[PDB]
Every structure is written in structure tokens, then in C-alpha cells.
């Protein structure tokens, strides 16, 4: 497990120039009292503003996504876990498509997301962080890989 702060430092290098990022958060997910504060500490540390929109049901995903875009001009979408709503095909399909159509890469918690068009995910192993990337979408979006991961980046077989 890669910490939220570590994720956002990765994001800072992966998407050059990013200033504002949007999170869609499942109101039924565990660890809210841990994670949501960590996101605002990570915002301050990284220089990237993090705006969180919370959803409880699939019906709320579209309206809350539109809010992130309208009220905030976020530059990327970041999803931290997928235990409930964010592990459903309908939510992934909506969020990926809508983010891409707005020019926003999607930073996701699993390869499942990459298969459907998200750009980057990560894992932590005994040698530290490694990256998994959707090659086609990452190339089109202009994603950059930090040099230290040059040998620690896999492209997902589609």
C-alpha cells in the first residue's frame, strides 16, 4: 500500500504542471478519519490543491463529478480505493470517460481501472514503489515517468 501523500508526490511528477486535483470518495469506505485529513496534509506538502467530492450511490457520481469540474477546474481525477461503489463497472466507466473528455488523466487504485482507460496505478513491494501504466492512454495524455522508476514501470497488457 502506497500512502496518499506518496501517491500525490508521484502524481506531481507524472502529470507535469498539475495544480488542482479532484478525488471522488465513497462515503461508505473505511478509514475516512485517517484518509481525508491526510489528503489535505498531502495538498499542502505537494503544492497540489485536492478537492474531494463524496458519493454514496452510483446516482451521485455524475452530479459530483460535474461539480468537481464546474466549481473547481481540477486537472486530474484520483481514486484512492475501490471497496464499494468505486469497484463497480458503472462508476469506473462514467468517471474514466468523463475525465478523459475533459483532458484529465485518471490515477487509480488498481489495474481494473487501467484496463478501462485510467492512466497510472502503483504498488509497493520489497524494493519500494513500482508503477503500472496504460501505455496507449498515458502516451496520448503526455504522462512523464520519474527517472528513478525507469526500470520500475510496467505497461499493462490490454
Q: β-strands 77-78, 49-55: how paired?
A: unpaired
Cross-strand bridge partners of residue 107? 78, 120
In whole angstroms, give the CA distance from residue 5 to residue 84: 22
The residue ranges of every structural domain in the chain are 1-157
Q: What determination technique applies here?
A: X-ray
Q: Which resolution, in Å, applies to this structure?
A: 1.9
Please report the DSSP string for the chain in residue order: ---HHHHHHHHHHHSTT--EEEEEEETTSS-HHHHHHHHHHHHHHHT-EEEEEEESSHHHHHHHHHHHHHHH--S-EE----SSGGGSHHHHHHHHHHHHTTT--EE-SSHHHHHTT--EEEEEETTEEEEEE-HHHHHHHT----GGGTTSEEEPP-
- Residue 24 and residue 86 in contact, taking contact as beta carbons nearer than 8 Å: yes
Amino acid at each position: 500500500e502506497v500512502t496518499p501523500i506518496q501517491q500525490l508526490f508521484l502524481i506531481k511528477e507524472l502529470k507535469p504542471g498539475i495544480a488542482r486535483i479532484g478525488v471522488i470518495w465513497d462515503k461508505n469506505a473505511a478509514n475516512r478519519d485517517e484518509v481525508l485529513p491526510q489528503l489535505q496534509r498531502a495538498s499542502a506538502a505537494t503544492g497540489i490543491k485536492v478537492v474531494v467530492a463524496e458519493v454514496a450511490s452510483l446516482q451521485e457520481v455524475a452530479p459530483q463529478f460535474r461539480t468537481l469540474l464546474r466549481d473547481h477546474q481540477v486537472e486530474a481525477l484520483w481514486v484512492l480505493e475501490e471497496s464499494g461503489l468505486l469497484g463497480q463497472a458503472a462508476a469506473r466507466s462514467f468517471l474514466i470517460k468523463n475525465a478523459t473528455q475533459a483532458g484529465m488523466p485518471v490515477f487509480a487504485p488498481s489495474e481494473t481501472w487501467l484496463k478501462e482507460g485510467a492512466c497510472v496505478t502503483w504498488r509497493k513491494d520489497a524494493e519500494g514503489i513500482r508503477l503500472v501504466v496504460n501505455k496507449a492512454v498515458a502516451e496520448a495524455m503526455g504522462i512523464t515517468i520519474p527517472a528513478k522508476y525507469q526500470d520500475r514501470t510496467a505497461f499493462l497488457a490490454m
